Amino acid sequence: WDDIRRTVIVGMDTAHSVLEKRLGVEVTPETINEYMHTINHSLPGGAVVQ
Amino acid sequence: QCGASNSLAIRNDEAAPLELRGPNYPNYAMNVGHQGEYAGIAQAAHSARG
Amino acid sequence: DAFALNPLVKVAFADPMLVFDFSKPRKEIARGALREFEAAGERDVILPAK
Amino acid sequence: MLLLEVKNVSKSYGDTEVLKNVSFELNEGDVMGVLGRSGAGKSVLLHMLRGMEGYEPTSGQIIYHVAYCPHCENVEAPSQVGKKCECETEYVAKSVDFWNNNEITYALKKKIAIMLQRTFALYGEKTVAENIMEALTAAGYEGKDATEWALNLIKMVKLEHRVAHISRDLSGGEKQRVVLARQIAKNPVIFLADEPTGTLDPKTAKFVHNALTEAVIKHNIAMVITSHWPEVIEELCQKAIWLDKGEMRLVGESKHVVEEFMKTVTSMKEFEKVEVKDELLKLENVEKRYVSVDRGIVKAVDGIDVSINEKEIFGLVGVSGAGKTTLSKIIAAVIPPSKGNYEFRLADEWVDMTKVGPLYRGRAKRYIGMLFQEYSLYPHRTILYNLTESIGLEMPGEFAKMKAEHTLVSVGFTEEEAENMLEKHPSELSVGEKHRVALAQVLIREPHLILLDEPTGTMDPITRNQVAESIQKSRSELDQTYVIVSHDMDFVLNVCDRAALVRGGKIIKTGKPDEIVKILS
Amino acid sequence: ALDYVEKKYGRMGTKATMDVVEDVAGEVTLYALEQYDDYPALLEDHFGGSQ
Amino acid sequence: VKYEDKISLYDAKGNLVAENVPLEAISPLYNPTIKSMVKNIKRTVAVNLAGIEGTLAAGKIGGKGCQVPGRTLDISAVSNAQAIADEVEKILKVSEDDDTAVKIINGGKQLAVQVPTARLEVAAEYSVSMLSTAMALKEALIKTFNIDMFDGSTVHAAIVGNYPQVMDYAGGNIASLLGAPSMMEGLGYALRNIPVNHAVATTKKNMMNAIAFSSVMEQTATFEMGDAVGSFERQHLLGLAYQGLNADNLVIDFIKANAKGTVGSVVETVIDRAIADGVIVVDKTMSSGFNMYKPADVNKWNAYAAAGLVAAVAVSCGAARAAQNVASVILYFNDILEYETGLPGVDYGRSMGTAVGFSFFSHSIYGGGGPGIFNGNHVVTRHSKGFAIPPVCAAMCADAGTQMFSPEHTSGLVGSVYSAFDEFREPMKYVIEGALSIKDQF
Amino acid sequence: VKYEDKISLYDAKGNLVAENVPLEAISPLYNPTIKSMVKNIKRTVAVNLAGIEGTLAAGKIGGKGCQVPGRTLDISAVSNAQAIADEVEKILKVSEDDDTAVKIINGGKQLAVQVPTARLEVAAEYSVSMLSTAMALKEALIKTFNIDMFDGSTVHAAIVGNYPQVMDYAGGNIASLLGAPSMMEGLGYALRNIPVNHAVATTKKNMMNAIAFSSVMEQTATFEMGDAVGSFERQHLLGLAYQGLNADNLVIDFIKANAKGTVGSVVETVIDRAIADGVIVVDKTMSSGFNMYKPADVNKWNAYAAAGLVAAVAVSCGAARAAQNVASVILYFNDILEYETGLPGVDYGRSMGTAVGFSFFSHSIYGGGGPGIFNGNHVVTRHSKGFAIPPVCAAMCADAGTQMFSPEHTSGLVGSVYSAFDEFREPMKYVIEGALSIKDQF
Amino acid sequence: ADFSYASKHADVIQMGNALPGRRARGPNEPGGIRFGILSDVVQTTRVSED
Amino acid sequence: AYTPQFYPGATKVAENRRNHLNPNYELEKLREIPDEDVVKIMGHRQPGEDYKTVHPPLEEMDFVEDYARDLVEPLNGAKEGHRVRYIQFADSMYFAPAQPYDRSRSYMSRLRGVDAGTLSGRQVVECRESDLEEFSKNILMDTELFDPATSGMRGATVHGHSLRLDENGMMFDALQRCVFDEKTGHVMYVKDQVGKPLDAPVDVGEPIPEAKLREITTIYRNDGVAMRADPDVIEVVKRIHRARTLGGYIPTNETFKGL
Ligand SMILES: Nc1ncnc2c1ncn2[C@@H]1O[C@H](COP(=O)(O)OP(=O)(O)OP(=O)(O)O)[C@@H](O)[C@H]1O
Ligand SMILES: Nc1ncnc2c1ncn2[C@@H]1O[C@H](COP(=O)(O)OP(=O)(O)OP(=O)(O)O)[C@@H](O)[C@H]1O
Numbered sequence A: 001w002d003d004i005r006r007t008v009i010v011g012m013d014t015a016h017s018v019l020e021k022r023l024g025v026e027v028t029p030e031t032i033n034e035y036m037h038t039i040n041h042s043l044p045g046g047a048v049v050q
Numbered sequence B: 001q002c003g004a005s006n007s008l009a010i011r012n013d014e015a016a017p018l019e020l021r022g023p024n025y026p027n028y029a030m031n032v033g034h035q036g037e038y039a040g041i042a043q044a045a046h047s048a049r050g
Numbered sequence C: 001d002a003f004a005l006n007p008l009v010k011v012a013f014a015d016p017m018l019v020f021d022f023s024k025p026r027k028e029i030a031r032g033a034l035r036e037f038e039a040a041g042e043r044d045v046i047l048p049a050k
Numbered sequence D: 001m002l003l004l005e006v007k008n009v010s011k012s013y014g015d016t017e018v019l020k021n022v023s024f025e026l027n028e029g030d031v032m033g034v035l036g037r038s039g040a041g042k043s044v045l046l047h048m049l050r051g052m053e054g055y056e057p058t059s060g061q062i063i064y065h066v067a068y069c070p071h072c073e074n075v076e077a078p079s080q081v082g083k084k085c086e087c088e089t090e091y092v093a094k095s096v097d098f099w100n101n102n103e104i105t106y107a108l109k110k111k112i113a114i115m116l117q118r119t120f121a122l123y124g125e126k127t128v129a130e131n132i133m134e135a136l137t138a139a140g141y142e143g144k145d146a147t148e149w150a151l152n153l154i155k156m157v158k159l160e161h162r163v164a165h166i167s168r169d170l171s172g173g174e175k176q177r178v179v180l181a182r183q184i185a186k187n188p189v190i191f192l193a194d195e196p197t198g199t200l201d202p203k204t205a206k207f208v209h210n211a212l213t214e215a216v217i218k219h220n221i222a223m224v225i226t227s228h229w230p231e232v233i234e235e236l237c238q239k240a241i242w243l244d245k246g247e248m249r250l251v252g253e254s255k256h257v258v259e260e261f262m263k264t265v266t267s268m269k270e271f272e273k274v275e276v277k278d279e280l281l282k283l284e285n286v287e288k289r290y291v292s293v294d295r296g297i298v299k300a301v302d303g304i305d306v307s308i309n310e311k312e313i314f315g316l317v318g319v320s321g322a323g324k325t326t327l328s329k330i331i332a333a334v335i336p337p338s339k340g341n342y343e344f345r346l347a348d349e350w351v352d353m354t355k356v357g358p359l360y361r362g363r364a365k366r367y368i369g370m371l372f373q374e375y376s377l378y379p380h381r382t383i384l385y386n387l388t389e390s391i392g393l394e395m396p397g398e399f400a401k402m403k404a405e406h407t408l409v410s411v412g413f414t415e416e417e418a419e420n421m422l423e424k425h426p427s428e429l430s431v432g433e434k435h436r437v438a439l440a441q442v443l444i445r446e447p448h449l450i451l452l453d454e455p456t457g458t459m460d461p462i463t464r465n466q467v468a469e470s471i472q473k474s475r476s477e478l479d480q481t482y483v484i485v486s487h488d489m490d491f492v493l494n495v496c497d498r499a500a501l502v503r504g505g506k507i508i509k510t511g512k513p514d515e516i517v518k519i520l521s
Numbered sequence E: 001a002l003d004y005v006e007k008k009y010g011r012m013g014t015k016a017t018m019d020v021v022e023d024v025a026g027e028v029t030l031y032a033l034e035q036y037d038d039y040p041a042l043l044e045d046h047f048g049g050s051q
Numbered sequence F, G: 001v002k003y004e005d006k007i008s009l010y011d012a013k014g015n016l017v018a019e020n021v022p023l024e025a026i027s028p029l030y031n032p033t034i035k036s037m038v039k040n041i042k043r044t045v046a047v048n049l050a051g052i053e054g055t056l057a058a059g060k061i062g063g064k065g066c067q068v069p070g071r072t073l074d075i076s077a078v079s080n081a082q083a084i085a086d087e088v089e090k091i092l093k094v095s096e097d098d099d100t101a102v103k104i105i106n107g108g109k110q111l112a113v114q115v116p117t118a119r120l121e122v123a124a125e126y127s128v129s130m131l132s133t134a135m136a137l138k139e140a141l142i143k144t145f146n147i148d149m150f151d152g153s154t155v156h157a158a159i160v161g162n163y164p165q166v167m168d169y170a171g172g173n174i175a176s177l178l179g180a181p182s183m184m185e186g187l188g189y190a191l192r193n194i195p196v197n198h199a200v201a202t203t204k205k206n207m208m209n210a211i212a213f214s215s216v217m218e219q220t221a222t223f224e225m226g227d228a229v230g231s232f233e234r235q236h237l238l239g240l241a242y243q244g245l246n247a248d249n250l251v252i253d254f255i256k257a258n259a260k261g262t263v264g265s266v267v268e269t270v271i272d273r274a275i276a277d278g279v280i281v282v283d284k285t286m287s288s289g290f291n292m293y294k295p296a297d298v299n300k301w302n303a304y305a306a307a308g309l310v311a312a313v314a315v316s317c318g319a320a321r322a323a324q325n326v327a328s329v330i331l332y333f334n335d336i337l338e339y340e341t342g343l344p345g346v347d348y349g350r351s352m353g354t355a356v357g358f359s360f361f362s363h364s365i366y367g368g369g370g371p372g373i374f375n376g377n378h379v380v381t382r383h384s385k386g387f388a389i390p391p392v393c394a395a396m397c398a399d400a401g402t403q404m405f406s407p408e409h410t411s412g413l414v415g416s417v418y419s420a421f422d423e424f425r426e427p428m429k430y431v432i433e434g435a436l437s438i439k440d441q442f
Numbered sequence H: 001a002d003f004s005y006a007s008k009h010a011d012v013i014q015m016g017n018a019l020p021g022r023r024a025r026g027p028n029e030p031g032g033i034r035f036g037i038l039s040d041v042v043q044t045t046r047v048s049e050d
Numbered sequence I: 001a002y003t004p005q006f007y008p009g010a011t012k013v014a015e016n017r018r019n020h021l022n023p024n025y026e027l028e029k030l031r032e033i034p035d036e037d038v039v040k041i042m043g044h045r046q047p048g049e050d051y052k053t054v055h056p057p058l059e060e061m062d063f064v065e066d067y068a069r070d071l072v073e074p075l076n077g078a079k080e081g082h083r084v085r086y087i088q089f090a091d092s093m094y095f096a097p098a099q100p101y102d103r104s105r106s107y108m109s110r111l112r113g114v115d116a117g118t119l120s121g122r123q124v125v126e127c128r129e130s131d132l133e134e135f136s137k138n139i140l141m142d143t144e145l146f147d148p149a150t151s152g153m154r155g156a157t158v159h160g161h162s163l164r165l166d167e168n169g170m171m172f173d174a175l176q177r178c179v180f181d182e183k184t185g186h187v188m189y190v191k192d193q194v195g196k197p198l199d200a201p202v203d204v205g206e207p208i209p210e211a212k213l214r215e216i217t218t219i220y221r222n223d224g225v226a227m228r229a230d231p232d233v234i235e236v237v238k239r240i241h242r243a244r245t246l247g248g249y250i251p252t253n254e255t256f257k258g259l
């Protein structure tokens, strides 16, 4: 039950489109890898560079 | 901002004694830094009376 | 059929990083019955040993 | 039959008759050319016909004669008077008089298209397809109709390599063609085109031109097109006027008019030779890639080795989208390269420049000035403030006025013109007066390496020869090195000495401008 | 706050009116902000304004 | 118009009123009495003035065992009930002829208010009545007894318990027949949130009147939920006519024929009447000799079975005089009817299953309780669309006092307030009159 | 009569319509136009036939990312359209002179059905419209294309979507302007469910008409909540008249006076107008100047401040041509007014608190969405009783297409359905006409 | 704020829905999990063909 | 007409708040930062290049006919159509000349079409890029609203508004956008407001002396000017609170008789 309860699936295609167009930030596979490292540090309890 | 008006109000959505108020009070249902001290003020109302 | 209702739920729970592997639900309930299942959510590092 | 009349209109701007005694007549389908010098009044006249704010006449009036539905507010062509609506009612003919608050004005204003001079009327973040799609949907059409057009249209201005590409990240003439393809796709009663081709290279200009014909001349939509660059006025218009300083110097068949205009002209000034002095910049394997998780890689610069030899004028010629602006931004230390070396011989030491900071790129960036292809000034400041106080001039404010006047004179303004221009806003100038002011703003700080992205583009041959002798004099009397991105060939022959050709992010061959010409043709 | 209330009102010496609310709350707020001004350690401990 | 089957009309005493009445004359979309009942049930609010006075005098605000020391107000609302009612009527009045009535019940102890219809025409729901009554009562109490500005919160807490914190009216002294919209278990279930005890206390423990009240409310709710539209409408119309209004006097005749009988005798009476009326016919005869039956009219057989279900409940719970037998009777009436005839049950077994869960949650540790606390909004009794609740109302009417959670214990304010209106107390004699008023318009 | 307040009515162009109109002529309890909009909102259902066809063709029933293999039906709902609309109208028909209206939108790909008021007269809540339309549409689809009995569940899932499991219409193709009554922030909050973008798209991006629509819905909701009852009714009527309906041309006058101005200039013009009209007077002058101001008419001062709030939002968002400024303009309009006069702001700080809510909801990663999805049934925006939402309509009407949550992206179906009604497309003109029709009865 | 909507409120897939009434519960509770979602949670189609 | 007062009080802090709120008060300028230098510290666009657009100019786009919407004159950046950018400031509690709520009130009283946001250690104003640059140079940077020591143009990591000043009297910066040059005695911005380094450091001038900072600040402090020395502001705050309370209780004229 714990593994089912703690699972949330979020899509990142509208976020990438908003980043590319409205925010003017390029979205590369390297940037996605950087974001994945950041969320893997930050999801349990982490605070990035603070 | 809406507090002073809602503190002594008599309208349905706005009136409640602070002992009967809680985190589901509509003004109080979003923000940090108020609720725990609201509970202490509610206690201090009766601590003065012993 | 590969899935029943949601393809995204099917792919998400195929993750090998899940502590409970949903490929063999009967086998792991046996492991939890024999006290050989390492579950998560234990506060062993914030509790005294005595 | 007749579409619009122009009565005797004299437009003035505080004792400034930008225009006087302007009068022409048009019918349902014809191309009208407006030919003249820089600052003659073509943009004022097109904003005048468009009915924009501040362009109201002081003496005359213009009459627009249209068709109209009193239940649908659709304006049409006058020829439609007698035909059947896209609604109930039949039609009604209206002599809309602009600047007379005549209701229809609104609907008519919606039915007229304008190509603004050096202004890209696009949504920026809405790509290329959605920008054109918007045009269709906005004007009408429907899912299929729009789709058909959208594709048929993107073909005409040649943009199939940038379909899902964001239009904000496009490159100059690509945005020009995007704005164009947005501008046919509204079914106008009139297409007013101010410098429709832009600073576009021969080949792409030809596509734009044929696209214009392929569409506007097919739907017999009257055309008002300006170019103070004739070869188009002829290949497009049949009846053209020649005005000089707001006065119609001639009104005739376009061929005779272009002839007469070209006689008034001057040849170049083929300056004296110059010897150059040592290498200053060295770029080794410069690459610039724009990777997207949604559109592919755009290798803007794809491995570029160039060398500049110090006091010299270097040319960069090519086709639209080749990578000239990306290269020039890499030289000016504005856009860092994805890969590759760039060293600048300050005096004898070569600073590695893909390193940000005063200890590194900054060192050379004090003496690097860049004039951008999409330039701007400060519109809330005056021209004098723009040359002197906006950028920071190392002199007291009392003596900056004559320094700015000297810079404007050296750019190619007369003493009276530079004196009258100093207490003025950039919105009160023309596109070409603003370009020369931005060129003076780059030049007035006296940097060593100067990058000029398309100095010409809106200059009569005479004004262009002017800016040209300017660059040559400053290079020799001040040993200033220049890097020029240009499309006018004769400018490269009579100005540059060691131009290079750019094609898809490559350097192909570098050599003399004549050698570059015979390589091109 | 308790000392200021007991010096001039008492624990239950007054009936709840507007004037006593204004007086007590204003005095305690002024004192607390004066203590934040006077002691930089207190201000650096409660670095956020919400605190 | 679209239904050509006619019904007779009988009162609660079994006397004939009229014949050849069209089926749509008792429809909720046509009957003026049902429309008036729905309009009046949305604007009528029960007020406990003595409860308000007791809550304020002891500081009993908050709910179950909650006392706030210091927030005690000594008012005399029961003595000044006339002035309070006058001020509430003045505040709630829209025009001067609006159907605003604030009547005094039990010598000032209770108050029955009716907010005007024009206040509900621009309201999307029915909650405007209780909120408007609460605000009018708050203003009337504040201006009648000169209550301090710092105690109006206590007055609000006395009138409505914990409304901003708990989206309900639990600790307050105001009430209505309908529950709060936050307690709805499905969309359109607002008319299903009337508990059985409320309907029994409203009708003053009259069996046929409570059956009519519950049936009218439940079938009007099925119209509201969209269940009784299209091809489903005739079945619910016949279920309302036969089970709830005793159209062909089926309920009274079955009860009279089984005055000293069991559930099985009622079952055979129903089958005999359905055979004699041509509603069901023999489908086939099996090798064992069992006569399998088929319905010649599906909806009419449904209505006949529902009327017999109510009759069986009345017979068994009048024999026992205890209201704990409803679930068993509803279960086994259908259970032996299906295997006696080969025919489906009252609601094609949606009501037998309702009894199988009612038998769970009326005899186990897991929830529910007495039969009087259930309703159509309850998760146990929501499954039968208006065919299982009027039996429960009849059984609670037949109870002699064997239930701890009686209507007297549960619905004292609501029953006393809503029994003062003739339309709510005796719905049979007014729904029949409303059908007679529009008998000639079909 | 009970209110001696007279107002002069103006149109959206600032021209005078009538003078000495009583204040209760624009009341929701008296105005026939407001009643008609409430009834039409309660009974109008929007049906996406193209969405139903796409869902059934691909088997996309369920919700976000949900797809059931094997449960795909290939029907042509858009191609038939008129037959489906006729069947739905026939099923939903009660009388022959019914108000049942199923019209065809965008060439068969959408339906705009209006259920009759007969089904809403016997309903306690507005949800009868969507459930009845869903049932009629299911029956029409099953009878038009011969759907097998085992695929009716698939048809129901395509039409409504997860309803017995999720008490809402999530993955379906049927929509209404009002959400589920069990999904309200508070009791009586049903009418504060229309977002800003729906109001802007319904009024075809007209400033004054969108303001009038939002104000009419918000103040009718405050009447529904019981808030505008007793001593608050005058303040809510004055707020509606001066903020939404441009009473005494205040909004247009302030906008005209501050064409080149800022928010502070709007504050100055509001204070000057309130001094000139006698609404506020000087209380006392302190030692350091600063003559304090007190209201001679408290509710009229609140109405003047609300009209100035709308005008300040219009001025700032017409200067910027961007709808992102709404929160700051309301917040600092109230702040500057309070610390300029010593007078309370709009809604006594509730407007400022709701502006703080708008700020943290539309300007941060903690925020979500833009100002176009602001509605009073949200926990962030519920605090102001109809005084902070109608300025957001002016802000979104002044937006030059720089918002991701544009009305075109979120409310195209709503605009195409509800723009056909005259009282919804131009609420201001028809509310003024309805007030003019009942002038002599006061 | 627009990016926040696009990144954490646009394509969120939850395991279970909130439950109303007397069964009042939040999302990701086992009463809100549909049968098809739970069928997609179990991964036996990956490793078995029976 | 009505002569607008702006803020109650007799102290220098109240006078400075009134001066900030007054649009007809000319703020004293204390430094000259060029327009391109302000653009470089802002970090939004390269100086000399054209402004990026989010939509076509308002003449090009077709809108519906709206009398009330067309009464208001749009900004120039809205007329051409420019993206909305921001400039963010942090203000120290130790006698910074401008303070966050004072900044927001003055911006919304003085500038057209701006989006002001107030935090405890942050204050941001959003506008169209050309107009934003114009009032950033004319009002926000060169006048007495800015001090390069006690205030700073900074986005991204903001911290140090409540911390003590450093050895040079500057506010603490975790990213160190601006440093102190002791050879010239001036503060130089070596990074832009978001944190990437600048190729050439830009002189924003020298720190304001503390004696002038006492006169030009808008904050109340025990070591400076306290509110106990300004009873008029406290009385106005209490009157606003009481009026809000009375309006929320019962909003009638008789209940406001006890005001
Ligand atoms: N708003 C204005 N106020 C005053 N003078 C103006 C204004 N706009 C343009 N002018 C002047 O009017 C004359 C005509 O300008 P216009 O822009 O029409 O030139 P043009 O013929 O289009 O030249 P170009 O080739 O530079 O585009 C110029 O001298 C210009 O400086
Ligand atoms: N930021 C960017 N992201 C993605 N692609 C880009 C970007 N900037 C430029 N490009 C693409 O890279 C190519 C080179 O652009 P660049 O501006 O260097 O062209 P150019 O040679 O100057 O052409 P033009 O004559 O139009 O100025 C173009 O096709 C352009 O669309």
Ligand SMILES: C[C@H](OP(=O)(O)O)[C@H](NC(=O)/C=C\CCCCSSCCS(=O)(=O)O)C(=O)O
Binding pocket: B028, B029, B030, B031, G360, G364, G366, G367, G379, I119
């Ligand atoms: C918790 C609250 O809901 P609730 O009170 O009803 O449970 C919940 N509130 C929010 O989501 C929103 C904002 C919270 C973030 C504030 C953290 S303070 S730290 C940085 C804040 S700032 O620098 O940007 O000002 C909501 O959904 O309304």
Ligand SMILES: C[C@@H](OP(=O)(O)O)[C@H](NC(=O)CCCCCCS)C(=O)O
Binding pocket: F361, F366, F367, F368, F369, F379, F380, H022, H023
């Ligand atoms: C009937 C109802 O109980 P209440 O009448 O609301 O107390 C409901 N029971 C249940 O659903 C119990 C479920 C599990 C117990 C029996 C399992 S067979 C509940 O708990 O809310």
Ligand SMILES: [Mg+2]
Binding pocket: D042, D043, D044, D117, D430, D431
């Ligand atoms: Mg021009």
Ligand SMILES: [Zn+2]
Binding pocket: D069, D070, D071, D072, D073, D074, D085, D086, D087, D088, D089
């Ligand atoms: Zn027409």
